[PDB]
Amino acid sequence: RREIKIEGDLVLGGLFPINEKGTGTEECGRINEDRGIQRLEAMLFAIDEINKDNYLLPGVKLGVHILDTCSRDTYALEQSLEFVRASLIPLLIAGVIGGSYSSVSIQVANLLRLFQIPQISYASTSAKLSDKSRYDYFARTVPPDFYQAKAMAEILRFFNWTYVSTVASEGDYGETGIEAFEQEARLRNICIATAEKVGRSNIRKSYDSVIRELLQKPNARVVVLFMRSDDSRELIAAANRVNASFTWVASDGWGAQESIVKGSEHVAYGAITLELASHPVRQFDRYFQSLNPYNNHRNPWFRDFWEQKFQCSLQNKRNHRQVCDKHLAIDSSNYEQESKIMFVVNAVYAMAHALHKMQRTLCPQTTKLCDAMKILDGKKLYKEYLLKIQFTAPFNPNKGADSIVKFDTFGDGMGRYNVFNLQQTGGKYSYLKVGHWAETLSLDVDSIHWSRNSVPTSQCSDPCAPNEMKNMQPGDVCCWICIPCEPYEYLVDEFTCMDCGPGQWPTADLSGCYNLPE
Amino acid sequence: FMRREIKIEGDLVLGGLFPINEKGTGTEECGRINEDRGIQRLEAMLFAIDEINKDNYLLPGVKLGVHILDTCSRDTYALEQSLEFVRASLIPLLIAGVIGGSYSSVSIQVANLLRLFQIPQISYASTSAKLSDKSRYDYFARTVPPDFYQAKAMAEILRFFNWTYVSTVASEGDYGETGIEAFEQEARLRNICIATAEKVGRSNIRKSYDSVIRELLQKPNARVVVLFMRSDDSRELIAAANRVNASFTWVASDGWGAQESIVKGSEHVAYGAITLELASHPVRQFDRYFQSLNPYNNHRNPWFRDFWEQKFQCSLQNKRNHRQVCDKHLAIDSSNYEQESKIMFVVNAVYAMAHALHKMQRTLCPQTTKLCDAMKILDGKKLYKEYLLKIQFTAPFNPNKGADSIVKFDTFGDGMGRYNVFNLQQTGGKYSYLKVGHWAETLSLDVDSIHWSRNSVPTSQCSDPCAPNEMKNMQPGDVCCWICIPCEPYEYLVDEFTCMDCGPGQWPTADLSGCYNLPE
Numbered sequence A: 001r002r003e004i005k006i007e008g009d010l011v012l013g014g015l016f017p018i019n020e021k022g023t024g025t026e027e028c029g030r031i032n033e034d035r036g037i038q039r040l041e042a043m044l045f046a047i048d049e050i051n052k053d054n055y056l057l058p059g060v061k062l063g064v065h066i067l068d069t070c071s072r073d074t075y076a077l078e079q080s081l082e083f084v085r086a087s088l089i090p091l092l093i094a095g096v097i098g099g100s101y102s103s104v105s106i107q108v109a110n111l112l113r114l115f116q117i118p119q120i121s122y123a124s125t126s127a128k129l130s131d132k133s134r135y136d137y138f139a140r141t142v143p144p145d146f147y148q149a150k151a152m153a154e155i156l157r158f159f160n161w162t163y164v165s166t167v168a169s170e171g172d173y174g175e176t177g178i179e180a181f182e183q184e185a186r187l188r189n190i191c192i193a194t195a196e197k198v199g200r201s202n203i204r205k206s207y208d209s210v211i212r213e214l215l216q217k218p219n220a221r222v223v224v225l226f227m228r229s230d231d232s233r234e235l236i237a238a239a240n241r242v243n244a245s246f247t248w249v250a251s252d253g254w255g256a257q258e259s260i261v262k263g264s265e266h267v268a269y270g271a272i273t274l275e276l277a278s279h280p281v282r283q284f285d286r287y288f289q290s291l292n293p294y295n296n297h298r299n300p301w302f303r304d305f306w307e308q309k310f311q312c313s314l315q316n317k318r319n320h321r322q323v324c325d326k327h328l329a330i331d332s333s334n335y336e337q338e339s340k341i342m343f344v345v346n347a348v349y350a351m352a353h354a355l356h357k358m359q360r361t362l363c364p365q366t367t368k369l370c371d372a373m374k375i376l377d378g379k380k381l382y383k384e385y386l387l388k389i390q391f392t393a394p395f396n397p398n399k400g401a402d403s404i405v406k407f408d409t410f411g412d413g414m415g416r417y418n419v420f421n422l423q424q425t426g427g428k429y430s431y432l433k434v435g436h437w438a439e440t441l442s443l444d445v446d447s448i449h450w451s452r453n454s455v456p457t458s459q460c461s462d463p464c465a466p467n468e469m470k471n472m473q474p475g476d477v478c479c480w481i482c483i484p485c486e487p488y489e490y491l492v493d494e495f496t497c498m499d500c501g502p503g504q505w506p507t508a509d510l511s512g513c514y515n516l517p518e
Numbered sequence B: 001f002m003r004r005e006i007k008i009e010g011d012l013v014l015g016g017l018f019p020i021n022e023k024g025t026g027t028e029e030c031g032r033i034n035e036d037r038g039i040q041r042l043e044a045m046l047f048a049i050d051e052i053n054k055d056n057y058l059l060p061g062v063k064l065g066v067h068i069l070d071t072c073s074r075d076t077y078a079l080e081q082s083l084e085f086v087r088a089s090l091i092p093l094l095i096a097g098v099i100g101g102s103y104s105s106v107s108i109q110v111a112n113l114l115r116l117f118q119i120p121q122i123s124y125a126s127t128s129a130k131l132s133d134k135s136r137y138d139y140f141a142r143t144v145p146p147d148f149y150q151a152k153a154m155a156e157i158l159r160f161f162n163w164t165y166v167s168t169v170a171s172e173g174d175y176g177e178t179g180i181e182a183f184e185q186e187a188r189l190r191n192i193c194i195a196t197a198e199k200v201g202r203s204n205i206r207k208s209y210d211s212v213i214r215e216l217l218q219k220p221n222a223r224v225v226v227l228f229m230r231s232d233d234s235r236e237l238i239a240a241a242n243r244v245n246a247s248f249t250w251v252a253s254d255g256w257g258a259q260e261s262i263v264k265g266s267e268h269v270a271y272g273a274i275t276l277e278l279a280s281h282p283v284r285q286f287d288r289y290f291q292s293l294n295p296y297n298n299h300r301n302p303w304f305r306d307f308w309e310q311k312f313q314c315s316l317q318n319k320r321n322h323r324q325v326c327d328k329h330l331a332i333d334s335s336n337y338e339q340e341s342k343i344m345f346v347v348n349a350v351y352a353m354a355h356a357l358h359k360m361q362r363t364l365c366p367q368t369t370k371l372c373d374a375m376k377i378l379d380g381k382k383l384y385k386e387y388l389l390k391i392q393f394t395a396p397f398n399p400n401k402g403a404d405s406i407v408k409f410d411t412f413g414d415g416m417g418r419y420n421v422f423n424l425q426q427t428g429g430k431y432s433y434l435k436v437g438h439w440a441e442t443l444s445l446d447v448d449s450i451h452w453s454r455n456s457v458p459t460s461q462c463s464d465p466c467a468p469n470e471m472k473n474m475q476p477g478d479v480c481c482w483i484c485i486p487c488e489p490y491e492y493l494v495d496e497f498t499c500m501d502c503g504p505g506q507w508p509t510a511d512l513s514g515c516y517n518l519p520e
């Protein structure tokens, strides 16, 4: 029963997948270091900054009530009940920052709307959340996968990968994400060899079984992935067991996390992944690296985090071995800012700017929470927050690279993505930015390192022999057969053989006909 | 400081929600006791549970407990209270299902909460059509029909008496608005125009209502006013009309229904009103039960005392600093109590949940009549889809079995769309409601037994009637309003809307019905 409760004049609830999904009968498992602990600290970071800022909510201290979602929608939902009992020890919640997984953000959203509690997600990308008729108190600093799916399909359409396999996570993230892709695929004449999907309480066999099925479609060497972070790790490990090798094209679920490929790097080599377009928040690196078990007591999960990151033990762990060097530290050699940290910070600041404007509007005489704001109107708040437009928390260089945080009419963020390629050049494995997507695809193909040093081929059928075969399309529009032609016929075009006619014969290259002698 | 509730343990527990108290006015959350739709309905659930707990053929071996809460007639409050039902699935009683919501707004919000934890819910009075949408309210069912039908019965009654020009007033919320929306659609199809569409709502005071009356008055021709309002709001509107002594022929939905409490203190303003209510029949055994209740033998209902003091204008030792202690011989009886119109639906709702749990226990626990391990943790999703397919004869408390006394649900989880039409009379010096018809699929009513307002069957049309002596009825663009064109002295009225030349040698009769020959 861990949580972070910090009092304040106004309190923001927070939800993070601090722990991985519990396996079997347990509800929570291992620590999610980057997407759990880091992101949690980024909200703590943002709250601290805002509490030191004399121009944003001066006179109104922001507190928090942060809870673990353990990467499970049902668990996050039960936890969230904590945010609403509040409006009846318990802290009144002005708004909630959170949900990483779309499924948890959705369920939490169905609960928070009942009590008019605004919610801002910093990572939930499902297109379902754009529906303001169902999630009317939900907003997010990231875009809907309606766009990510387009970026992925256009990438395949570029390298002409017309025959691919897809595996998607069960849940609102993977399923709706994969559906969007399928639609985008059709429109670009891309066929799906086989559509697999893993899900809830799935064990090895479920994944091993997916690898087998992918293998049963040898021609489909490129496999599209729209899977949760946890499931991705599982699928990669499975491929590693039977040493399966495909060119992976995964969504942000996998993203640019090295943790997903750890221990199966050669299997994911050459993979192409996507992640929302972002830039690290510099002041955050300083904050996070200054954290250690001695100065960070407000984060009840930090000790378990520390022990797992460094393979520790102090006096607060199970019956293990190897105590830990008091000189260990989070630093430039073992830490790298999580890709979505920026969105966590701007989500919190968005809520703050929305409360600030509301306080200036209802409390014109003081900087304090006046009686008129004693009981917040969350409906108004949400429609005082949707219209917000401000420059990304100080923590962002320039102001011309469109560093403005604001929301769509659907409460969504801008659909900008970056494309990455998992390389290893320097002995070590890393993600290199090899392109991006803003409205049209963009990537310099020369910097990409493929699997098996060769740009992958993923088509239904083998290419026809030149010397004489014509391309023949059967019933579908992806597969075909090759029909060698009569020695006296030439290829008027790729799919049609025609008689050169009397006195004539086809040219060595079969492009035309030359006259016969004798 | 003291938030009351009823907690009775059992092998299985049913949550309950009833508007025991009226909406609180101003800063307070709850107000006066709602006697009929509050206390009665509450006790009808306690009644049903007792009977079930004595029935050896229904849930024998499994005692039903309850967790009944007050909604104070407010969705937000009902919502906060319901949280109690979900925390339970984590002192607290585990909820197998919830019986409740009277007002649609509370049933809807509660349904939005309960579905998240797959807790089945059966409402005994919420009629909003929205609730038929199993894509949003997938854990909700009800023993009553959607107003999709009630609105049709109302529009067909107007179309009958040719009331083509009417005003409407709807309560803000899912009951009044969706209800009035259905009527508006039904009206158009039957060529009925709406003079003015008013609507009262949340935190509304006198002026909001007085203002509605004034606007109704600004449409004198529309003498018939259609109402689709909550009980509480209805009472306000009628009180408002009573102040400026405004008089219209009211056609109200079940919200008003056949409650005498709505008209009390303004009976002459509501005289001749026509109201609808769901077709039901009193549950005889309940009369006996409710009548045997008194502050001495009914300690399990923590609201009964307040109830008592208000019904009789009492005081004992558990009340404010008032006067007049109360006669220890008072008693609820045939002279001061009449079964609330929807009691039958509360009993059936509760019985439906029991039958659903009963069938599930017989299925999952084949060796005993006890709640076996297999059912220690109920699968609410299954319960709901074991409960939707339920079909049984109305709790013993219903005579015959041929008048279709079978409780079941639509594919939408709704009940059957059958209504009764009532007329507010006063013949015997006292005001009362008289059944003057009913609606099953087609309207039906014997016009002769109806007592109208101002002893004359109302006229509710757009334009003033044409002068006889020479005017012809003329229809412009719509089918509700018209203009009257006096005719030439040499024209007669071949028909109400047509003037024709009598032709040479002839001249129209004083009456204008024909032409007579000219002398000279």
Ligand SMILES: *[C@@H]1O[C@H](CO)[C@@H](O)[C@H](O)[C@H]1NC(C)=O
Residues within 6 Å of the ligand: A158, A159, A160
């Ligand atoms: C097939 O893909 C290659 C690789 O980008 C490209 O050069 C070529 O133009 C494409 N051909 C088709 C079918 O458009």
Ligand SMILES: *[C@@H]1O[C@H](CO)[C@@H](O)[C@H](O)[C@H]1NC(C)=O
Residues within 6 Å of the ligand: B160, B161, B162
């Ligand atoms: C309604 O109008 C019809 C047709 O004009 C008429 O026959 C009927 O009597 C009217 N209904 C009543 C009873 O007012």
Ligand SMILES: N[C@H](C(=O)O)C1[C@@H](C(=O)O)[C@@H]1C(=O)O
Residues within 6 Å of the ligand: A035, A100, A101, A102, A103, A123, A124, A125, A126, A173, A227, A228, A229, A230, A252, A253, A254, A340
């Ligand atoms: N975009 C993911 C989702 O909406 O579910 C979210 C990823 C993240 O936390 O960055 C998590 C996921 O892997 O699904």
Ligand SMILES: N[C@H](C(=O)O)C1[C@@H](C(=O)O)[C@@H]1C(=O)O
Residues within 6 Å of the ligand: B037, B102, B103, B104, B105, B125, B126, B127, B128, B175, B229, B230, B231, B232, B254, B255, B256, B342
């Ligand atoms: N049928 C009403 C509704 O759906 O809201 C319900 C009436 C009742 O409790 O009998 C209450 C109301 O007044 O609206």
